[PDB]
Structures are given as C-alpha cells and as structure tokens.
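Cross-posted from the bioinformatics board.
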Amino acid sequence: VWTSSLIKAGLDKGISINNMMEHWDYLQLTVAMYINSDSVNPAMLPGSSNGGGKVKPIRGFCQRLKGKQGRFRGNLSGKRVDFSGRTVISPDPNLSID
Amino acid sequence: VMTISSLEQRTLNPDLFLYKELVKAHLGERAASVIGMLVALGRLSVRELVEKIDGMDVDSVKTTLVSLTQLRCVKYLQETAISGKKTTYYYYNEEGIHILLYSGLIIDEIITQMRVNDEEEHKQLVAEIVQNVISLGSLTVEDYLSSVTSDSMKYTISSLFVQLCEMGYLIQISKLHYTPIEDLWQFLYEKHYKNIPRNSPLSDLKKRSQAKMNAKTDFAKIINKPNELSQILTVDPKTSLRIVKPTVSLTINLDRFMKGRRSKQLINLAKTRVGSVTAQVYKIALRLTEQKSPKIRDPLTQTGLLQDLEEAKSFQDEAELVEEKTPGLTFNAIDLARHLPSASLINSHLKILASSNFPFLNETKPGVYYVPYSKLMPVLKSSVYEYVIASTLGPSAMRLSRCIRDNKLVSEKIINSTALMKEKDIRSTLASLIRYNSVEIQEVPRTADRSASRAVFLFRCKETHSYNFMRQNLEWNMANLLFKKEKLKQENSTLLKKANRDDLLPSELNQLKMVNERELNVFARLSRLLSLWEVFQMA
Amino acid sequence: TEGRSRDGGLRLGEMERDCVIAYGASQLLLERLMISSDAFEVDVCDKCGL
Amino acid sequence: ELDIEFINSLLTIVWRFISENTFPNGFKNFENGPKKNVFYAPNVKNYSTTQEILEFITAAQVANVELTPSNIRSLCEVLVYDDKLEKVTHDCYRVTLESILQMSIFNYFKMFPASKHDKEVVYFDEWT
DNA sequence: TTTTCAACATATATTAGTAATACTTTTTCTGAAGATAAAATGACTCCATGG
DNA sequence: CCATGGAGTCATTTTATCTTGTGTCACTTACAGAAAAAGTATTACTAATATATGTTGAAAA
Ligand SMILES: [Zn+2]
C-alpha cells in the first residue's frame, strides 16, 4: 500500500522519471518477494520497518505452502489428529492377542 | 461494491467484445452468442459449435448461421481433407457486423447521389431503398421491385436504376467472394507449386518468385472481377434504356463507403490548413477522383502473406506510384469546375490548386495542375492522425509528445531544454501520459549491471503502439455507449412495446422525451466516436 | 496443537497415512483425516465455484 | 534565457507578429475576411520570419537583455510543437491558422461537456 | 594558625513589559545430482559466378 | 552447365543453474543534509526574599 500510494500521489504531480522506476521496481520486488522466495538481497536494501540487521527469514508465504512441514505436505496430507494418546509400553503376556 | 463500479462489463473484454454486443443489440438472442464464440475461438466447424454453446444442435447453428449469412455476418468456407466426404469451416465476416455498425453514415451516403434531385420523397424513396437493402442483406431488383407495387413508373421507382452503379451501393457477391481473402490466397497459391511441369529441380527460387508472381497476377482480376463488370451496367432491354442485371443478387460494397466516409476526414483535415473557399475546391475535387482511389481497399493482400526485408518494399513502392499513374489519367488535370458557386471569371480561381502545398497534394506531371494520388494517400494517411489527445490529456501534453516526435529516444534533460517548463510540470504532463502508453520507455544501464538508481532513461514513440492506443476507442465506449442504448431499453421495456402497438397517460408522456433525447444523445456520441474511429483500423 | 504442554493430539504423517491406504480402509481414513480433526462446513456456489 | 517563467510572455507577442507575416493582418469580422486568396497568387509570396525576429525583438518594452539567433530558433520550436505555427524550409516559418483557435466535428474548442446527471459519457479513462 | 564569623557578593525566580539577536530545535524536501539452455560446432544446401 | 564460396539453418555439446534430501515429542528465547518556521535564551531593569558558594579575610585562640 505504501510504496503504491507513493507512486499514486507521485506520477500525478511530483517526483521524476529516474526517481520513479526504482520505486515501481521496488514494488515489483515486494509483490514477487511476497508470493515466493527467489530474490533475497542483490544489494537492493530494504524498506519500511527494517533496522538494517540482515534478517534472512523474510517470508511467510510460498514457503508456508511449499516444503518441510509448512502445510501442503505436513498440515494437510499429514493432519495432526484428535482423540489420541501416547505413552511408554510394558509387556502383558497374560493378555490375549488383539 | 455498489455494482455502479461497472468493471465486469468494462475491462476484461477487448476486441471480440464489440461484436457480440452489436449483434446482441441488433439481432440478439441465440443469433448473437454464436458469433461471440466464433470470433474468440477462431475458425470453427458446424458440429464443433454445439460442443460449447449448448445451442440445441444443428438447429440454431444452421438457422442462425444462414440468418447471419444473408446479412453476411460470417466468413464461409468448405472443403475436404484427403480422406473424403466434406466439411465446412467459418469465421466472423470481414469487418462484417461493421456494416451494421455504421448503417447511419451509410444513410448519409445519399448526400453524394442526392444531387440532381433535392428535397424530395425521391430522397425518402432511395433512403427507404437502402435501409431495406442492408436490413434484408442481399437483394434483387426483380424480387424487390416485384414485391414493390406494380402500376407505377418502373424506371422512376427504381431510383438507383441507372444509378445502382455509381461507386457505392451494390455488387454481386459471387461464391468465393466472401470466402476469406487470406485462404483464397492459399487456394490460388495452389495451381503454381501444385502445377510445376517439372521445370527444373534446381532453384526453388524460380519455383518461388514465379509462383508469387503467378499468385499476384492471377489474384489481380479476382477482386477486380466483382469490382466492375458490364453484365450489370450494359444491359438495355426492349422498350427501355440501359439497365442493370436485376437477375443478379447484389449487396452494398462498403469499400466506396470506406472511401466516402474517409474523404470527409481528408476534408476536415484540409478545411483547417487552407481557406474555406479553396477548401471547398478540394471538397469537390475528391468527388470526381473519389472513385478509383483504392484507399481502404489497397491494404488487401497486405494481410495474409509473409512480409519481406525486400519484397515487402517491392509491394509498397508498387502501391506508391500505381494509380497516380494509370488512374492518374483518370485523376485531375483539368477539372470541369463541376458546379461551384469564384463566380464571374472562374478560371484563375481554379489555378489556386498550388495553394495546397504542405503537407499533402502539391505534385503533378510537371506543370499541369494535378495532384499525386496512390503515393498521396501513403504520404497523406501517415499524417492524418492529427491531434488524437487534445481536450483529453491537456494541451501541454501535445507540445512535448509532438516534440518526442521530431527527435527520437530523447532524454528528459534535453527535453527540458528544447521543450521548456519547470520540471514540476514535465513530471506530470509526461508521466501522466506514459500510463496511456504512447511514449513507452527506452533505458540503458550505466555504471551497474542493471539496477534501480544506476542508469539513465530515454523516451521514444513507437507510433504503432501509439496509433494502437486508440483501438481501445473500439472497446472504449463503443462498448459502453451501446450498452447505454440497451441497458436503458429496460426502463421503458414494458412501456416500449406499449408505445409501439398503441398507435396517453401522464408518466408515459413524461419520460418519452427523456429516453428519446437521451437516445439521440447516445447515437450522437456513436456518430462522433465512429468518425474518429474511422482512421486507425485501416489507413 | 503440537505435543504435551500446549495440549494433546497426535500425528499421522505422510509416511504413515499410506498404511491405512494399503489396508483399503476408506471410512476409517475419512473418519480420521476429516471428521476427527477439522470438521468444517463450506458454502460453495455451483455456478463459478468459489 | 533563465530557467523559470515569463517565457510565453514574449512568445504570445512574437506569435502575433509571425501571424501578420503569413497572410495580411488578422481580418476576422464576418465569414471570410482572411487573405482574399493571399493577395495575388499565394505561391508568389515566399516568405519567412526567422532573422527578422531579432530586428523585431529590438522593440523591447520589457526588462531583459537581447537574445541570440540560436535561442530564437528554439522559441520557434516550441510553437512548432504546440502547432501554433509551422516549420518550412529551414528558417522559414508559417502559421497553422490556429489563430482561429483563439476565436461531425474535430475541434476540442468551441465545445463543452454536459457533465451532470446522465451517466453515459466518453471519458479518456475507465478503461486504462 | 586555625577556626568561626562575617561579609560581600552574587545568583537564584516571579512578573512583567520591550526588541533584537542569536540559537536550537522541529518540519519539509530532495540526490547435494540431474533436467534446461545457450552458444559454439559443424554439416547441408541454396544459391553466387565462370571456362 | 557446372565446381566454387558463402551463408543460412539446423543437430550437438558444454558450459550455466535449482529442487530436493527417514519420521515424533518437548522445550526453548528506506540517509543526510538544507531551509524554513517556531520558539526561545539573553539581553537590562527593582524588588522585595533565603539559601549556596567562594574567598578571604578578618577576627579570634
Ligand atoms: Zn458463484
């Protein structure tokens, strides 16, 4: 929203051609950054709410749907269950089979 | 959100969209939605339609199909593969529904032939003629005049009669006539590689160029066969004068409606840059020569054949000199000074032709007063676009958009030099423009690989994309405007049929003039936008 | 939710679920990965399914 | 010049002279007053303005310095871009007759929108 | 020599009025392996002229 | 008329690349500076008060 309404109030009156396409670019890098991993920091540097600490885990998107157990594999086909129980074991041979 | 948004009805339907509302707004019902499928999905076969539209097989398809064909709303072909049997393939006719799309300025074409009889029912007569002709599609003066009352004056009835000829109105539509041009270039591109009497195995070039040459020269008379042939014109029956061949079915040839509607635009361009008097001289000067100029007919096979890094030029320059030469003898050396108001000594008033100099006309055989033509239109059309973004984007937009025209791929620093204003303005009247396309962008990287703030920008034209930003004008309100016409029909939808079959009430009288003046506005718009749209689609 | 502490509930992994497939137990599997875990109603529009 | 305004201040003046250079002076009263076929044989008048501008600029009546032939050329380039006037044969220049702009159809001027109530209008946006 | 006094004085705070200057702020404002491809490799052939 | 030279297209490698990698608990802990604006601290005045502070010094032991 921010880097958009920038260009929205921009391009109406102020800014400039050279100080435009780097914004609109940066828009492109967020919206793609948004739905997938790809680009991390090819010396592009971040926007609002950074601090400049070099934080690698920047996404909670394509990954949440993708690998490991985010969701697709673990949380959907692999659903955690209900009405269950877990415990250690001990033999009871005086008990029948089954 | 509120539905007054009007997005669904708006953005996602280009190209095709116009058609399936036109026919819907015109024919409608099942008769429409078939074409909507036909344009979108390309060439299509009779049976294959039903797998999609769910139109009650071989019922609507057949009935609505011929329902289109007499109105020539489809392009029609049939053939067989090597296995056998037969099959039929279709298209959306030419510009086609286009014929419907004007139909008003085709009413205005009276004004040309309107001369020699003015302020008459004869006007109303020939108007009734044409408005019946397009509506009924193909006609025959034998069946039409037969349905027309007897015991009246035949050669007086017919109006056209000896006029049917002119440039416009009608021609026989013959067989492969509306078989698609592109494909008949293939069928005619047979017979040549098809028949090679084992000439030489070497040099497919001798096979190739000769083929295309054979393909070109054999194609020539193909469109000229309908163009004019005396089978219509010459006939002179007994107890009568020269007649057409009413035995033949004819249909309006839009090419001379192309030419006619266009020459008006050539006027309104000239009616600017010269004086109104000599302007008028240019106004009638076309009326004599508006006949043979190919105009919107000249692109023709410019569709359908691969262009060339050379042969495309040998096709261009051919169209450059051609009719400026042979029809150049049909063109204007000494005009009759046809009618004119100027008066008294009229001759040097005619010598004013040279007053037309830039940017058009003003060429001849050396010193006979005359105009170039087949080359004229090419050096004319390119400069017909004029102001297409005036009183829309603001005048400031012109000056630099015009400036971007002179030089090319120019950077805003020196735009700020040649053109001038505080950059605060440029970054509006330019940046605000680029959203509407035109200028596009060139950019080159400097002291980087490619980056954000590590390069410089340049601005170019690509007038194709420019001249193509106004084909949205098609989808623009020719989209919406025609809805306006339709989606309001529901206000009186119950009142409309009441008012038609009644010939009362206060509220009936109330919104009659409302919805009507409303209409007359919506079609006023349609005429205006149409007049603008007359340019970009061809020429 | 995961583990003890939080609460309970346990895990049928992509690896394990195959087991009940091999038996060919339908109503059990659907009784496990559906009713027992998240049973949820959705209202879908036949036209333009969403 | 300088980089800021009072550019068109002199532009509107030079345009008025260049107009007189084309055909005779304004002559707008009734239907056709202009040029009466440009004196005799509009072709026989072959005329620029160009260099003469500097001699006309001598009139001053404004706070400035003089100005070079070069920059004048750009001053004229702007009115080529605005299409107030026309560039022909190097330094030769005409006017586009769009002095009439001063005062179906094509002419954004002498036209006005409705722009109330009825929703059927032709914008240049809402397709975009 | 030292200590207590004293004592002298001078800030310290209020409320003003100026008036003027100087001085900080603030607020704009911009300059791990195995598919996929890309290109260099090379053979094929159309097509050039000439003895 | 035909062998030649030159190029144009078209298989064919070999380089540059990206997606994966057994399962479950149970805790765990946007650059910086520039300019404009706002406002203020002295900068004198009495004028009462009553500590602090310094010094010093004078006065006393
Ligand atoms: Zn729905």
